[model samples]
Target: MINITSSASQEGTRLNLICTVWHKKEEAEGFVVFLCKDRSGDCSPETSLKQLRLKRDPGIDGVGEISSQLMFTISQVTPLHSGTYQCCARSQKSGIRLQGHFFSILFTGNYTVTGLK
Candidate 1:
């Protein structure tokens, strides 16, 4: 299972999200992280705002049995970027669905960008 968190700063100039994944074995295959945004409040494949891929990390830090945490940075943001954001994890090797594998999960949160200086 993976734990996810998404937050925006006061200025809203940057958005930082973190995901912590855990497995029983030493390591699994790999995973790709994505940032999905939507204004509908209900996010899905059809309502994705943007898709930013985080390459697979496989190793001591890449795959952790206890738990592994990954961070994402969204810079030079704008007011339009203010909306609901969700983080998803997908398997790298399988490409398709496989048993004992986790499906894509999302974290629901809002983004508020402050007015100009």
Candidate 2:
């Protein structure tokens, strides 16, 4: 349903989130993906991402789904960045028309400064 991964580079650290969302319609309208600070916290500035339409079942069931990739990179990795973050995904039915409450899911991850850099 959801997954998170990360990698540290000389420049910074990158948090990768891969997720899937199920829809009740065939077209499914559109999609939006972002990153959050916590379960009930504000959104992150690096909360921008894209998605891939995984499958579309155009039958009586009228179900469809999509997969997404979200990357939040800390340009200046430091102890200040050590905290908890959330990865979120959502599919919409129309432009600024959907409530974003029905078709959505979130996954959270934690980062810490272990070494004495």
Candidate 3:
């Protein structure tokens, strides 16, 4: 399971969140990461919240052998974009072809837009 957490500098501000995934074992092969605008709405592979590339972060310690990380930045968050996002971690070497594990990202909060006035 992947654990995701996010925060903003202030109310009604852009959000930049970093996600990190740790595998229970090593040599887990590549992974797929995505974001969803709606937790319950349709999240197609073509219409994912956001897609990111995962790489090694040497600075972070004890991040497991097979680590995947992604960073997301929302220029202006809206109520419609709020939901439990889903992040998936797939093991390339899994017995099933193209099979991998899936993780959920629960984003809950309200943004106060201040510049529209």
Candidate 4:
């Protein structure tokens, strides 16, 4: 099973998405991580929306269970960034596959444009 954790942030705040992968094996190898964002009503392969492959980070050392996390971070956010996010990981070697999804909402805010006087 896969567990997902998402954060809600105001406009101009950082956004983070974390996906935890759990399996029975001792280790997972040759697994690929994928991330997708759904802004339109449909989140499809042909939609051509924002999608990326996340890099796997080395989890805590000396851990008994075979689990890892994939973290995707955005430096800043705006109203247009509100959408549904999905994370997926698959491994043919380990015969493991997992997916998780989350949603984010932005609050109304004002923007300021200032010039040096």
Candidate 5:
């Protein structure tokens, strides 16, 4: 499962985005986590964001595993950073395979930075 959660100040001066990925040990790992503003899963050049590779620990016996998280922050928020943002987590290959492999999972989060204008 992949989740994208976001929060911002009351005045919309700062923004925080949290991306999490959880999968069974028998499945794949998280290859990359990226932010896409006003677009789909692909990353954008308009923003100063970049793709990040997260390491997942499936645990010793594949038990007691926790979700991998990626954090994003934006300062001095404005209308330019408003609207929809896509948090994508691409699946990485592992030793265990051949069980309904998924390429990527995307979640959408919206920010209302409209009052700045």
Candidate 6:
């Protein structure tokens, strides 16, 4: 199972995208987390977050079962930042492949400025 959370913020404000993944009775090794943006009505790697100058937090280890949390932060949001964001995770063990379902959110930034004429 996978879950994602996102928030709306004003332009220039920092924002965070959080994703959590869980699996039953599995040792989650070699799991990779990725962040992507929706492009031209399709969610593909070509529009990944790396192109947006954003960074994601490395996931933590789990015990017995696979449970990890991934976080991505945007230092500053702009008017063009409004779009669909997706989080994905995948892992494999003992020749069994596990691909996490994608979780997405739409963020619309409200551009605001202070001390501006």
| lDDT per residue as tens, model 6, 1-117 | 433233333334676664455543334444444566654444333545632211123233312233555556767766555555555544433343232333333344453322111
Model 6 TM-score? 0.50
lDDT of 5 at 103: 24
Give a tens-digit lDDT track for model 5, residues 1-117: 443333323335555654455555433354555555555433432342555555445544222244545556666555555465555555445322111111222322543332121
Model 1 vs. true fold: TM: 0.44
Please tell me which model should have the higher TM-score, number 3 or number 5.
5
- Residue 57's C-alpha lDDT in candidate 3? 39
Model 2 spans > 4 angstroms off: 1-29, 39-66, 92-117
Work out how many backbone clashes candidate 6 has.
0
Stretches off by above 4 angstroms in model 4 are 1-12, 39-65, 92-96, 110-117
Give the worst 10-residue stretch by lDDT in candidate 3.
Answer: 96-105
> TM-score, each model?
0.44, 0.37, 0.47, 0.52, 0.51, 0.50
- Per-candidate Cα lDDT values, in order, are 0.43, 0.36, 0.44, 0.47, 0.44, 0.44
Residue runs of model 6 more than 4 Å from their true location after superposition: 1-12, 24-26, 39-47, 50-66, 92-117
Q: Rank the candidates by TM-score, best first.
A: 4, 5, 6, 3, 1, 2
Clashes of 3: 1
What is the TM-score of candidate 5? 0.51
Per-residue lDDT value at 40 in model 6: 46
- lDDT, candidate 3, 27-91, per-residue tens: 33344455544445455345765654333433253244555555566676666545444544333
The lDDT leader among the candidates is 4
Query: Which stretches of candidate 1 lie above 4 Å from their native place?
Result: 1-13, 39-65, 92-117
Q: Candidate 3: misplaced stretches above 4 Å?
A: 1-12, 24-28, 39-45, 53-66, 92-117
Worst 10 residues of 6 by lDDT: 51-60
Number of clashes recorded per candidate: 0, 0, 1, 0, 0, 0
